[PDB]
Symmetry: C3
C-alpha cells in the first residue's frame, strides 16, 4: 500500500527526522514537486510544431528530482549527502537561453500566446514561487546553494523557452501597451 497512514496527523519524514508538513523544508521540496508536475503538464501539450522542446523539458524534470532530493536533506546529516551540482545543468540552461534569445524578435512582454508558450510562462512563475520558498528555508537552515543558483536560472530559461514556443507556431508575443 502506497498509503502508510503515518502522515494522517500532519507529520512526515524527510531524508534521514520527523517534521511538520508546514515546515519550511517540506514546503521547499513540495513547491519543487509542484513545479515538476507542472513541467510534466507543459510537456504533454507539445505537438508536431513544438516537438524539439520535448527532450529538454524531460531533462529538467530529472534535474528537478535531484533538486528536491537535496532540499529534503539536512546539510549536517552524516549519512546523507548533497547530490546536485549546478555547473553542468546551469551552463546548459544558459546556452538554451542565449540560443532562444537570438532566434526571437528583439516593450515589456506579457505572458501568453500559444497554449504551450503560456504554459511555459506559468512554469516561469511557479519556478519563482518555489524559489521564494527555497529562500525562506535558506534563511533558517543551510541548503545546497547550487539548487538555488539552478532554480534562479530556470525561471529565466522558461521565459526564453516561452518566447521560442510562440516563435515556433508563428505567434507574436503579448506586449504591455
Amino acid at each position: 500500500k502506497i498509503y502508510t497512514k503515518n502522515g494522517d496527523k500532519g507529520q512526515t519524514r524527510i531524508i534521514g527526522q520527523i517534521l511538520y508538513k508546514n515546515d519550511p523544508r517540506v514546503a521547499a521540496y513540495g513547491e519543487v514537486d509542484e513545479l515538476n508536475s507542472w513541467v510534466g503538464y507543459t510537456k504533454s501539450l507539445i505537438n508536431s510544431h513544438t516537438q524539439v522542446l520535448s527532450n529538454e523539458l524531460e531533462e529538467i524534470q530529472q534535474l528537478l528530482f535531484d533538486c528536491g532530493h537535496d532540499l529534503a536533506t539536512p546539510a549536517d546529516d552524516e549519512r546523507h549527502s548533497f547530490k546536485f551540482k549546478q555547473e553542468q545543468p546551469t551552463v546548459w540552461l544558459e546556452e538554451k537561453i542565449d540560443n532562444y534569445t537570438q532566434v526571437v524578435p528583439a516593450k515589456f512582454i506579457l505572458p501568453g500566446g500559444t497554449q504551450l508558450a503560456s504554459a511555459l510562462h506559468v512554469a516561469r512563475t511557479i519556478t519563482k514561487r518555489a524559489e521564494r520558498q527555497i529562500v525562506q528555508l535558506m534563511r533558517e537552515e543551510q541548503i545546497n546553494q547550487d539548487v538555488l543558483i539552478f532554480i534562479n536560472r530556470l525561471s529565466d530559461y522558461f521565459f526564453a523557452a516561452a518566447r521560442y514556443a510562440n516563435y515556433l507556431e508563428q505567434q507574436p508575443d503579448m506586449l504591455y501597451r
Copy 2:
C-alpha cells in the same frame, strides 16, 4: 450583486467572525478551493479513452466542498458544526488506490505522460500544498482532523489515478533515470 465590497479592505467573514484574508484559516479553506477548481480543470480534460474517471472526480469535488466548509468552521462555534466524516470517503479512496495499483506496471516515477495524467499529477501536488496549509492551521487552531486524514489520502489517490490515466491511453510512466 455577487460583489458586496465588504472585502475591499482585506477582511472577510468565515462560517459564524471577521478575519484577515491572510489568516491561516482563510488560506486553508482557500487552497482547498484552488485544489477543487484544479480538480474541475482536470475533469474537463477527460476524453473517450479516460471517461471512467469522470464520476469519481465529480464526487471528489463534492467531498472537497464539505472539507472547505469544516475548515471555515471554528471548532468551538456553538451554532455551527463539523459535517465531514473521513471514514466512508477515505475507505473509498483506498479501494481505488489498491485497484489502480494492481492494474498498472509494478524506479521513482516522474510526474507526466498524457495530458490528463500530468494534470492528475498536478492535483497530487496541489493537494499536498493545501495539506501543508491545513497543518499550519491545525498548529494554531482546532480543526476537523477528519479533513486532514482525507486530504492526506487524496494526494495518494491522485498518484494512483495518474498512473492509471497513463495506463488507459497506452502511455508508459515517466521514470527517474
Copy 3:
C-alpha cells in the same frame, strides 16, 4: 543576457532597495505574476465558441501588470509613484459581472464544466491566493489600496466569467448536491 546572476544568492531588487525573495512584497508582486500567466493560459484555450472573451482577458493582463508595478513600489519612495487607479478598471469589471449574472441561469456552484470555464475557475482561486498575499503585505507595509479593491473584484469577475463560459458552450454549471 537576460540572466544577471545578481539573484543567485536569493536576493533581488524591487522598484527603487534589495530584498529577500521570500519578502512579503516580492511574494505579492510574484503571485500577481503567476495569476497573470495563468490568465494568459486561460486565454490560449479560447476557441470559436468563446471568442468574445479574448479582448477582456488581454485587457486584464495589462491591468495586472500595473498592479504588480505598484505592489513592487514602496509607498514612501520619493522617485517612484503609484500608477494604478481602481475606478475605471473596477467599474468595468462590475458591468461585465452584472451582464454575465443576468445572462446565466439563476444551490452552491462547484468549479468546472468546459475546459475554458474550469480554467476561469482556476483563475478565480489564484486571484484569491494573490489577494491573501497582498493582504499579508498590506499588514506590514503601506500599499496601493486601489490594487486590493481591483483584485478583490477580479475574483468575482472570474466566477461570473466562468459561468458565462459554461453558458457559451451549452454546459450546465457543476452544482453541490
